[PDB]
Design a protein around this ligand. Structure first.
Ligand SMILES: CCCCCCCCCCC[C@@H](O)CC(=O)O[C@@H]1[C@@H](N)[C@@H](OP(=O)(O)OP(=O)(O)OC[C@H]2O[C@@H](n3ccc(=O)[nH]c3=O)[C@H](O)[C@@H]2O)O[C@H](CO)[C@H]1O
Ligand SMILES: [Cl-]
Ligand SMILES: [Zn+2]
Ligand SMILES: [Zn+2]
Ligand SMILES: [Zn+2]
Ligand SMILES: [Zn+2]
Length: 266
């Protein structure tokens, strides 16, 4: 595939799910070999694992005293579309959550793709690797195409479910929204997070219920979302990725752990 940028500057704005503050994004075109980077208060923050500063409830980056929260969704959409050269200017402290999915970013960026004059240098998984953390596991192995499976095991009605993304099925995961359980709200608010959360940008699930009046988009919308998150975190390898991945109960922390182990090995 050829390296790609955007045809023109694209803008997005809205509340950050964790800060509860308004922020604005400006996606700038960039030349071949630039890579994906964020820009905030005069500092460039590359979208790479060396710049990850926090992973508990979002994937956050920082450099030289400047931090940006919740990069997982914009990075997943850029990865899915193979956008390789772009500057994401952030006026604020977090990426806007919008409806909690990648839909708005995906629809706008997909209509503005500009192919460039280089073949993409893919990050190619060369051998099998397994990373683990207290009941959670992620396996990666060689593959000519990006294939990502997430298997969840939930304490509520969702039970045990899995979903697999393969290239060409981007539309199956870009609408899946972020979610949380009603029993998690206390903790998230207590640690100074979830300030912008509402039923308009997060699915809220209970032991037997879906609080959002619209309900779920898909019966397995939560696992489709976890696949979407893993594809965003994999872009921290700094190039579009080719490999077959299987995550059992993974989250941003384990995804970043896998990315760092893959980067170290290769
Ligand atoms: C008007 C009133 C409205 C009320 C609404 C406002 C409430 C406050 C706003 C909340 C906003 C946040 O909700 C945003 C936020 O944090 O969104 C995160 C997102 N970033 C990503 O976070 P992360 O990847 O780090 O998540 P974990 O993997 O760690 O899972 C998390 C827990 O699920 C367990 N788990 C996991 C997998 C499994 O198979 N089984 C199982 O049990 C696991 O053990 C752990 O206890 O995905 C999470 C989902 O999974 C989202 O919640
Ligand atoms: Cl925390
Ligand atoms: Zn090619
Ligand atoms: Zn926490
Ligand atoms: Zn997240
Ligand atoms: Zn997410």
């Amino acid at each position: 595939g050829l390296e790609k940028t955007v045809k023109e500057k694209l803008s997005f704005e809205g509340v950050g799910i964790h800060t509860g503050e308004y922020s604005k994004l400006i996606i700038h075109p960039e030349k071949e070999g630039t890579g994906i980077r964020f820009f905030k208060n005069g500092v460039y923050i590359p979208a790479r694992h060396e710049f990850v500063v926090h992973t508990n409830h979002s994937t956050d980056l920082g450099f030289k005293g400047q931090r940006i929260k919740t990069v997982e969704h914009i990075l997943s959409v850029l990865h899915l579309l193979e956008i390789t050269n772009v500057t994401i200017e952030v006026i604020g402290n977090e990426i806007p959550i919008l409806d909690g999915s990648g839909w708005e970013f995906y629809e706008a960026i997909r209509k503005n793709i500009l192919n460039q004059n280089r073949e993409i240098d893919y990050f190619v998984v060369e051998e099998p690797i397994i990373v683990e953390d207290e009941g959670r596991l992620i396996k990666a192995e060689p593959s000519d195409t990006l294939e990502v499976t997430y298997e969840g095991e939930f304490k509520n009605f969702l039970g045990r479910q899995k979903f697999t993304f393969v290239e060409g099925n981007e539309e199956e995961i870009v609408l899946a929204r972020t979610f949380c359980f009603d029993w998690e709200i206390e903790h998230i608010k207590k640690v100074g997070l979830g300030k912008g959360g509402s039923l308009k940008n997060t699915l809220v699930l209970g032991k037997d219920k879906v609080y959002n009046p619209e309900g779920l988009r898909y019966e397995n919308e939560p696992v489709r979302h976890k696949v979407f998150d893993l594809i965003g975190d994999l872009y921290l390898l700094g190039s579009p990725v080719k490999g077959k991945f299987y995550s059992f109960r993974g989250g941003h922390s384990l995804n970043v752990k896998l990315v760092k182990e893959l980067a170290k090995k290769q």
